[PDB]
Design a binder for this molecule. Sequence first.
Ligand SMILES: O=C(Nc1cccc(-c2nn[nH]n2)c1)c1cc(C(F)(F)F)cc2[nH]cnc12
Ligand SMILES: O=C(Nc1cccc(-c2nn[nH]n2)c1)c1cc(C(F)(F)F)cc2[nH]cnc12
Length: 263
Amino acid sequence: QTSAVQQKLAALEKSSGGRLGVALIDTADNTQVLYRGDERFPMCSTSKVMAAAAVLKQSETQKQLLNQPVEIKPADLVNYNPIAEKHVNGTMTLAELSAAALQYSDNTAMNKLIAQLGGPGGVTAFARAIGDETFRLDRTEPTLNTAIPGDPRDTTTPRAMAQTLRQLTLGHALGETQRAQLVTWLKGNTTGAASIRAGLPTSWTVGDKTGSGDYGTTNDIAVIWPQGRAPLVLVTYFTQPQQNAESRRDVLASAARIIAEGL
Ligand SMILES: O=C(Nc1cccc(-c2nn[nH]n2)c1)c1cc(C(F)(F)F)cc2[nH]cnc12
Ligand SMILES: O=C(Nc1cccc(-c2nn[nH]n2)c1)c1cc(C(F)(F)F)cc2[nH]cnc12
């Protein structure tokens, strides 16, 4: 079947010229709303959630792991380093690196998380351990954002990412204090006001992680606490045919508004 919500998301997509993927989980009832829910999309920096969560899982058996210093050398800086560049020739703790990756989208910080996990495959291994058979991380920053159409590297599906985000933030994939820490980090994101949250009523609380890449790829994944409702999890992924395409956070906002209006 095709629902009224799906039909509106298709109209949005058609007007945008790109390819839109949406997955909602309403924890009011566990119901799901999907649009291209089983198609693959480049995750870009939305993958930083899985990396940070994998480090939080490691921390469950090492009380001091999040306090552990990691050297930042000049050669570690990549293409977007707002926090890490201030610590070159110094150190950042794994907590600081997690916060920087999630809340500022720092790519050097993400690479330190990936390295703590033994490389991209360590992030994938964590995904598998928490029941996500779809996610794959294949490369480090910045090349994981090439977002080439048809390339399976560094992709997931909306369905899989929504399920995983639910399990991490609302379920029991992490221990209690780790789940709370992940939620605190997502709620304190600096980069999200133009994306999913811009499509939702202002009284709703959002924690999210954005991403973007080549092919005008523009993404957001969010855990949402609506006014008067149980929490929602919402993934919005968007990618375009042209390598040089402009980002389109407004399309993500529009998708979120359709979803909200359909509840
Ligand atoms: O920093 C960003 N993009 C970036 C960084 C490094 C390099 C390149 C790049 N490399 N080749 N072309 N562009 C692009 C960024 C972009 C976006 C947007 F609008 F969605 F596109 C939102 C953001 N919020 C926080 N940071 C961002
Ligand atoms: O790294 C990149 N973008 C970036 C960096 C940091 C943060 C964010 C971001 N966070 N939340 N939204 N966007 C995005 C990027 C990289 C590359 C490449 F070639 F693969 F290396 C091409 C790009 N075209 C547009 N952006 C990129």
